[PDB]
Amino acid sequence: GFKQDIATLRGDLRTYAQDIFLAFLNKYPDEKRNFKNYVGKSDQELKSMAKFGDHTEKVFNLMMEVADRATDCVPLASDASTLVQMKQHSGLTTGNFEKLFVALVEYMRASGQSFDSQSWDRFGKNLVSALSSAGMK
Numbered sequence: 001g002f003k004q005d006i007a008t009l010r011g012d013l014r015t016y017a018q019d020i021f022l023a024f025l026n027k028y029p030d031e032k033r034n035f036k037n038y039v040g041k042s043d044q045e046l047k048s049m050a051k052f053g054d055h056t057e058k059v060f061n062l063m064m065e066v067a068d069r070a071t072d073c074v075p076l077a078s079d080a081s082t083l084v085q086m087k088q089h090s091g092l093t094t095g096n097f098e099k100l101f102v103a104l105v106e107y108m109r110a111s112g113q114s115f116d117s118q119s120w121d122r123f124g125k126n127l128v129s130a131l132s133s134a135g136m137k
């Protein structure tokens, strides 16, 4: 289920983080309006860029902690308020998060592994709700 998937992802986190973020950017190319230094790069070139690997790993490190602190795929209000208040998220709306979790769920469905994709769909929907409640536009 969801808890085992956190452990699976954590066991190879930099590859999963990079591959899921690339699935997001490739499905939603307009989302590079928030990632201007990733324009004009293939996936293998992005994986060679220090902040791409570093920042994406740090994003997924925190995402896995928010998932681990959740109950039944519902994140803590304190985690939602952290993600709204972060200065690096000043430009963002809940639709940015919705698209990330659509891509993450599609990535899990396409894998041969027994990911609990429905739980990740719920977690994304519940994180978007918590972000909206905590004041993200």
Ligand code: HEM
Pocket: 031, 034, 035, 051, 054, 055, 056, 058, 059, 060, 062, 063, 066, 083, 088, 089, 092, 096, 097, 100
């Ligand atoms: C649960 C989901 C998310 C988590 C846990 C998260 C967490 C983080 C963390 C930890 C950082 C700091 C990275 C660093 O400085 O090394 C960061 C920066 C950032 N996040 Fe988020 N984030 C999430 C979702 C999103 C989404 C959906 C977007 C936009 C589509 C986004 C856009 C950014 C941007 C633009 C930065 C700063 C630019 C950069 O670090 O390259 N984040 N995020």
Ligand SMILES: Cc1ccc(O)c(C)c1
Pocket: 021, 051, 052, 055, 056, 057, 059, 100
């Ligand atoms: C959602 C997301 C994924 C990776 C990454 O580097 C940043 C900054 C955000």
